[PDB]
UniProtKB/Swiss-Prot annotation, chain C:
Protein's name according to its UniProt entry: Leucine aminopeptidase
GO terms, molecular function: carboxypeptidase activity; identical protein binding; manganese ion binding; metal ion binding; metalloaminopeptidase activity; metallodipeptidase activity; peptidase activity; zinc ion binding
Source organism per UniProt: Plasmodium falciparum (isolate 3D7)
Sites where the protein binds a peptide: K289, D294, K301, D314, D374
UniProt subcellular location: Cytoplasm
Length: 509, 510, 517
């Protein structure tokens, strides 16, 4: 619980913003039928043109003569609907009050993807960050379903919010005009919850490794559990030794921060008809160990993000703990540690023993995630659960295979895999199914240990890692989500909080 | 048609073996319900034991010989186990008092065998064939296989048994017996397998041929020769017709070569009425040096890059199978933009803007991404034919080794139905393929400042970005792209797989 | 003159846009003391707030419209701040009940705008011009600018506003609509009026240079580049001469000829000349590196970071020289004779290429040991400098994308200048100040000269002292015997990586140099 320090100026906790300006925003949703009022603030129309880079056309009654003249076809024709393009103007309305009116181009395709919507939102966020507004009103002259509408709000809330914890005028009202308004009203408060779960997770990821270490991360986890009335249990070195979790403990041998195993539990006050375990990779810093990240491209300044899985899980815990779904018992697990170089570090070639008795030959100390997850997976299966889903920034190959938008899912069960893809669809956190190819299993056959940590090959590293993990689930439906490529937003230089909404939709639906 | 030379010792054709020792093998299939006869040669029993770890081998099959039956009694066989890949050889005398040889191959613990360890089963069998000067091989199936897997057994047996000695200078069986239950249903698979094998081995021959032998002219010559031995309409476009067709992307790639570009266009048409028109496109880079983006990086594998025409080989390999089996109600076009990517005073340069045959201007960012340039023009041509399906197959991106590896190929496309047909074809051909996404969000990375489009991204999903490129040259036709860069070469055996041939033939047949 | 081809689809000339939409813009400058008329298009105020960091916006120019004046009152305007780069659009009706567009661009709180600051200001202006279909732009200067800062505003505005579509076919922009009129309100307008057409000229010289650079190497080759230059000389009535290979052979330019040996394109030496109608008090030779593509040769650019796709850029010096030729040929300065020189070739990999280790002989007799074929620029420049000095000139200034080390030394904004004469260098610095193309003076360190001592040849091409920009300047110095000479290394500043396009760097610098003596 007490965070060790090297000098007195070393941080002993992660700063967390719980009450964000987003929570102060009153959201009202109206149906476009009946006309739009353009009293105060900034009003943005979401317009497309099914053709490409075509002219903007507003087709919604505006209960204001002055702003209608502005929105006349001849004047709006100036402007085009290219995805992400926007223009906003300041003017006097009938009350000659100063109002701002504009649009965001939504391309030429009727059905907007999650990527398209983000681009729509970022442009919207760009106008909000340069204006001293009181109210933002968005008019939907495009087609979006209930899930995409919620995705819109979530993304708006998340991108609008700015993290100033390590640094030394937000809108107070949000208006929305849409067709089946009464059907969309319920998605508003769900978005507000999903946003913070993601933003909460983001905060942990963005937290530098001197702030976010195994001790402070587990401490932060306990505090969240306490605020939500979740049962919690933190395993220390002595208990981990008694549980024989040698793989997980080996990775952390070289750290000044003691290993901390995070175990939260949500249990429903009804009948329990589904037990789910969520496992997140919690490497507070990945130096690579003795296989130090020194090669051109390793991105070592990166590696505080190696606990993104843990963040997604804790972020998920917030959402579930807030929404309190029925008929479920959920375990939020993370084997948290730090992978460092020391006199005490574990070595390449070392043979270590996991909690299920299997000996593992370490071939690369930078492949630390599968070791911590292995012992985490054994712990999970002993709980007697229906599904085990782990989420991890495991392999960089994901950047070459799937890139920065879609995460990969691996598994031993097609039904479980299918539930994750559906959750990807309704949460709009894109996931693609990748195969666990049994032919590669032999490359993990060690000469001295029961199994290799790695293949001698760089061929199919994400798949080989899934084969490894597969060895630590005996008789349980299990899935593995590799978020190494999608976790960090390189363009915006911040986390995405990837996985929080995905996992929440999985538990709820 | 005439291959240019630098010295008089430069080869002017690819040596091709059409009649292989496999074709000389008389194959007979009998039903197990009648007993197995021995007498001659080597007889191998394929045995498993479902539900035991490495259980004892037990023969299940009446042997029409009293004392090879006594030899095969369980007390004698309990010794031995069915561990996958395990094999033993037996010497004994039959009823007549003559010397016979018998043995077995273990098929593991799983009732339903692999696609991969059927390969190991076959590989184990071939071990028995290489160190032996046998005249007859007999295989008894005491495992259960469906119609597709049996054909696959023969194909793999044929392919692995065969040895390529075309480039060497300074004992094959003549009969194959198969004992299997519902033999009468399986007999139809025998000649289909032999056809599928050679189409694959034919592709293998073209792929294995070094680049001084296999160049744009000689490969195109070989394609013409194939069209003639089959009876397909054929036409080869040289530099002059290609200029008239304005195929600037394809022509740029070959500018630095001593070998003129040759576009291969074979056609199979059924005498029936035609309900499906299909264009099959293969990447045909006879050698990929990388150009001015020279392969000087450590993982470049500059020595194996004769393999960069695997797509073309798969397409031509398919052409053999289709041309022999003569399917109904279908019209097939075999297309390949064949050229060589070299470094020269005449070679295309990084930064260059070139114009494709559909009018789109392209900024070349990397000369080693040459395949998509040739395929783009090949794809424009394909759509001009007015077909229902366009499928290209290519060793396009090295990233496939990192994504799917050396066993599974990746398939991309603009049409889910076509993707599923490729997928089904993967199951029945047993050439494993996995569906990968075309992520439209990465399309913006191909937006060039001066040309219509970039050839490459700056940025890493190179396989996905390359597919995004290709999609731009198919406007309104169902199209799929198979990236076999990772699976084309069998690194362990130091030989090609001829991957894609059987997949494409099963694709057109269904 | 005839460009050789590999296939018939190979381009045989560089496409050049001469009549640009910028030239079609009628520009008027009015005095602010008379008030601003707003009544079409978009009207933009360049605003400041001296001493208030992100301070409030306040318009201070009489607006000859009651409705627009009321809109622009301080009470309405304070909601906005003057943050440098900030911009806003306003919609309103004027007294004649017509809809007009008005806005502002923040010019910060610092009285004196830098060259970097002014560009940022302009960039924000062009954004308002893009994606909007305006017919008129009116710009109001509520800041203080001298004439060459004012001129810099128009040049940069013109340059950034213009979009190059020579190589688009199926993706030309559907919405490219240029304004037809440009209005400017400024104090003491009669003093600034002279800068307008000077800006237009400075703009095109720069854009012409940008066009040559942006043109890919299959379009822009040694032959096609010399041809456009000749066509350029003809349109300006300049004396011109292009040297082919065996004229170069019998001027014995072995270094220059070596670089092009591996190319399918013959070497072409550009020699354009401007002579004043009057008596000549200054003779100047301008020498530009003209490598239409730098592959590196047998020292191939294969290392991570070599940026081989960008190397069609290697003739930026040459382009800067021709862009200057345009400006000089148009403005017709007095008492001056200018030689515009460029030894053009392409550095390629071939059986005919020159090799590392080769000893070659320059036109002044000095033998050179080649240590790196990617150090080709100094070889072509060596012979060009000898040619230049034989012209009997007073100042020789060469401009070249010579060393990537400039990225490590000065970065992407400032070019480096080397020289053998302080008077010339300062003139370069003075022209840099008035052209607003930033240049910094770097030393030629003689102690490093010994690293060029070859065992067999008279001199080494390169060092074995990783201070490469200085070593290269030491090399170049060896081919100038008794003439004031300066060397401007633009390897770091020529290409705009963010905007993914050329800068046309050097044109305004070189022209201001010629104009001010
Ligand atoms: C097995 C690899 C060493 C994993 C490494 C990876 O993808 N490397 C390329 C990844 O980054 C990591 O192990 N992170 O902890
Ligand atoms: C340049 C294209 C990407 C193709 C190229 C290739 O993949 N080169 C690279 C390499 O071998 O290091 C590489 C591999 C994986 C990921 C990125 C880059 C392959 O040689 C080819 O010629 N394909 O047509
Ligand atoms: C080899 C030359 C001494 C330096 C070469 C260079 O600067 N290379 C850097 C390494 C980048 C230069 O860019 C050039 O090729 N000039 O022609
Ligand atoms: Zn690691
Ligand atoms: Zn890690
Ligand atoms: Zn290549
Ligand atoms: Zn290739
Ligand atoms: Zn060079
Ligand atoms: Zn150069």
């Amino acid at each position: 619980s007490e965070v060790p320090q090297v000098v007195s100026l070393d941080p002993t906790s992660i700063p967390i913003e719980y009450n964000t300006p987003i929570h102060d925003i009153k959201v009202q949703v109206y149906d476009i039928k009946g006309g739009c009022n353009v009293e105060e603030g900034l009003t943005i129309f979401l317009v497309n043109n099914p053709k490409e880079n075509g002219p903007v056309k507003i087709s919604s009654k505006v209960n204001d003569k002055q702003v209608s003249e502005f929105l006349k076809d001849e004047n709006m024709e100036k402007f085009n609907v290219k995805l992400g393009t926007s223009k906003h103007f300041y003017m006097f309305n009938d009350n000659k009050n100063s109002v701002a009116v504009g649009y965001v181009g939504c391309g030429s395709v009727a059905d907007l993807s999650e990527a398209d919507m983000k681009r729509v939102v970022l442009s919207l966020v760009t106008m909000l960050h340069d204006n001293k507004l009181s109210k933002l009103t968005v008019v939907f002259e495009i087609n979006v379903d209930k899930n995409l509408f919620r995705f819109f709000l979530e993304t708006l809330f998340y991108e609008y919010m700015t993290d100033e914890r390590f640094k030394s005028e937000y809108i107070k009202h949000l208006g929305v005009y849409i067709n089946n308004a009464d059907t969309y009203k319920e998605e508003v408060e769900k978005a507000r919850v999903y946003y913070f779960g993601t933003y909460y997770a983001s905060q942990l990821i963005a937290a530098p490794s001197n702030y976010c270490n195994p001790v402070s991360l587990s401490n932060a986890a306990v505090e969240l559990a306490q605020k939500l009335n979740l049962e919690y249990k933190i395993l220390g070195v002595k208990e981990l030794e008694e549980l024989k979790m040698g793989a997980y403990l080996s990775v952390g041998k070289g750290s000044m921060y003691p290993n901390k195993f995070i175990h939260l539990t949500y249990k429903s006050k009804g009948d329990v008809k589904k037990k789910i375990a969520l496992v997140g990779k919690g490497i507070t810093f990945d130096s690579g160990g003795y296989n130090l990240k020194a090669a051109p491209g390793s991105m070592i300044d990166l590696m505080k993000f190696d606990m993104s899985g843990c963040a997604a899980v804790l972020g998920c815990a917030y959402c579930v703990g807030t929404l309190k779904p029925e008929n479920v018992e959920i375990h939020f697990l993370s084997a948290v540690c730090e992978n460092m170089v020391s006199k005490n570090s574990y070595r390449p070639g070392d043979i270590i023993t996991a909690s299920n008795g299997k000996t593992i030959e370490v071939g690369n100390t930078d492949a630390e995630g599968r070791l911590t997850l292995a012992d985490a997976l054994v712990y999970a299966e002993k709980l007697g659960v229906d599904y085990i889903v782990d989420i991890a920034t495991l392999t960089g190959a994901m950047l070459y295979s799937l890139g920065t938008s879609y995460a990969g899912v691996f598994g031993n069960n097609e039904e479980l895999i299918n539930k994750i893809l559906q959750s990807s669809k309704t949460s709009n956190e894109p996931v693609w199914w990748l195969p666990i190819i049994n032919e590669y299993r032999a490359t993990l056959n060690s000469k001295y240990a029961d199994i290799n940590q790695i293949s001698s090959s760089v061929k199919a590293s994400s798949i080989v890692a899934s084969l490894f993990l597969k060895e630590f689930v005996q008789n349980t439906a299990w899935a593995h989500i590799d978020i190494a490529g999608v976790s960090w937003n390189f363009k915006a230089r911040k986390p995405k909080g990837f996985g929080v909404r995905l996992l929440t939709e999985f538990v709820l639906n």
